């Protein structure tokens, strides 16, 4: 996260770290949506152009963390993966359209003050909150700058959703209805963005109607980090909710 600040303890209890077994390194962020399901970006797992193709045995998910590098004894919980599900139409060849994946944990995780699931949006919550100008929040342990520069603890930054025409005109990449972009404009005087290491993490919003936090997006891609005239792109979770519900209904329990 660029231009963010230290998160408070327990501020994003659904934050998940995707951790590589060997070598042991931070791979991506992710989020806890129930006691046994984690949501992340497909490209964190599968990306042929860079010979990236992780299976359930190559990774671990660490939940309830705050510090990036410590083993937070008696606080964090580490889980092994049972199965990884990538969206069948994830387009890694062209623009990362439908950049979403679900991960089923081997055993349910117990909730605590530091581990708690985020909600998935329903049609009306998405309709009501996904508007230009409205701010959401991104968290992660990714780089603090485009060319480090690594935080000691979880970082957070609040960013406004940007009008679609503006998102489209900032890049040569073909944008789809399954993505939205966020970030401040060159003339807004505020900045901030996700960066390497933050992908797969959650973009959340707090409903003013029922005071619950909802995951509206998944950090997907960007060109550089916190560059003027450029914006971060996020997978539109609600547009892909039917697929999510489908996987959990069929392979759940």
């Amino acid at each position: 996260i660029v231009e963010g600040s230290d998160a408070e303890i327990g501020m994003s209890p659904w934050q998940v770290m995707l951790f590589r077994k060997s070598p042991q390194e931070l791979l991506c962020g992710a989020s806890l949506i129930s006691d046994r399901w984690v949501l992340t970006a497909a490209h964190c797992l599968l990306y042929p152009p860079w010979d990236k193709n992780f299976t359930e045995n190559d990774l671990l998910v660490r939940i309830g963390k705050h510090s990036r590098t410590r083993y937070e004894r008696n606080i964090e919980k580490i889980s092994m993966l049972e199965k990884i599900y990538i969206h069948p139409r994830y387009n890694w060849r062209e623009n990362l359209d439908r950049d979403i994946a679900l991960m089923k944990l081997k055993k349910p995780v117990a909730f605590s003050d530091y581990i708690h699931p985020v909600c998935l949006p329903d049609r009306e919550t998405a309709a009501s909150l996904l508007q230009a100008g409205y701010k959401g929040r991104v968290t992660g342990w990714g780089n603090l700058k485009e060319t480090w520069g690594q935080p000691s603890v979880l970082q957070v930054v609040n960013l406004p959703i940007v009008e679609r025409p503006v998102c489209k005109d900032s890049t040569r990449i073909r944008i789809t209805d399954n993505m939205f972009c966020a970030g401040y404009k060159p003339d807004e005087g505020k900045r901030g963005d996700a960066c390497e290491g933050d992908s797969g993490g959650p973009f959340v919003m707090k409903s003013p109607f029922n005071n619950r936090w909802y995951q509206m997006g998944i950090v997907s891609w960007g060109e550089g980090c916190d560059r003027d005239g450029k914006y971060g792109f996020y997978t539109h979770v609600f547009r892909l909710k039917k697929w999510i519900q489908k996987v959990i209904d069929q392979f759940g329990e």
Partner: peptide, 11 residues
């Protein structure tokens, strides 16, 4: 750099 985690999780 990362602190080592318990062996239990690596087997």
């Amino acid at each position: 750099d990362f602190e080592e985690i318990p062996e239990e999780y690596l087997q």
